[PDB]
Design a protein around this ligand. Structure first.
Ligand SMILES: *CC(=O)NCCNS(=O)(=O)CP(=O)(O)OC[C@H]1O[C@@H](n2cnc3c(=O)nc(N)[nH]c32)[C@H](O)[C@@H]1O
Length: 159
């Protein structure tokens, strides 16, 4: 039937993995609560179904082996979350057993004023991995559709 793309949101705890996913599926912003979500979207004329796989703390290859594309998310107010991207990127290539895994670098919480990671820092890392970089904010919905839709276009090109 219609193509179904399996997406996985990886990143440190509290960067915005859940809020970005909830903002995409339900148009809702989450502050504090405690999964798997599906949604039908239209990208570049074709209609498809998005299956999002949000990640928590320790538990993991079975979660990543099913993911076709991966979102590596960090928060601009958290300096540590940026250096964690290397380990996440390092594990994606191992579990998927490939170096050209479709992924997008996402810098969340661009709404916040206190910028601890300048813009010129994350994009050069995305150039190192050869992947796009998109500033997002789960509060203002800025770039939320962009990050997920771009990840789908990466998956459609590798075929
Ligand atoms: C370990 C783990 O991932 N736990 C998830 C539980 N977090 S939560 O409270 O359910 C939402 P989350 O995004 O994970 O929490 C992070 C905090 O940062 C704020 N946030 C999230 N996205 C944001 C955004 O796009 N813009 C802005 N300005 N703030 C954003 C949330 O309110 C959370 O408190």
């Amino acid at each position: 039937g219609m193509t179904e793309y399996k997406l996985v949101v990886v990143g440190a705890c509290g960067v915005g993995k859940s809020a970005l996913t909830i903002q995409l599926i339900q148009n809702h912003f989450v502050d504090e609560y405690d999964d798997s979500y599906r949604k039908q979207v239209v990208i570049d004329g074709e209609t498809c179904l998005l299956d999002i796989l949000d990640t928590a703390g320790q538990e993991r290859d079975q979660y990543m082996r099913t993911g076709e594309g991966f979102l590596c998310v960090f928060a601009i107010n958290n300096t540590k979350s940026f250096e964690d991207i290397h380990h996440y990127r390092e594990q994606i290539k191992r579990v998927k057993d490939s170096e050209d895994v479709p992924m997008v670098l996402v810098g969340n919480k661009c709404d916040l004023p206190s910028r601890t990671v300048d813009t010129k820092q994350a994009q050069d890392l995305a150039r190192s991995y050869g992947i796009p970089f998109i500033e997002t904010s789960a509060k203002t919905r800025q770039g939320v559709d962009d990050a997920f839709y771009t990840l789908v276009r990466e998956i459609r090109k590798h075929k």
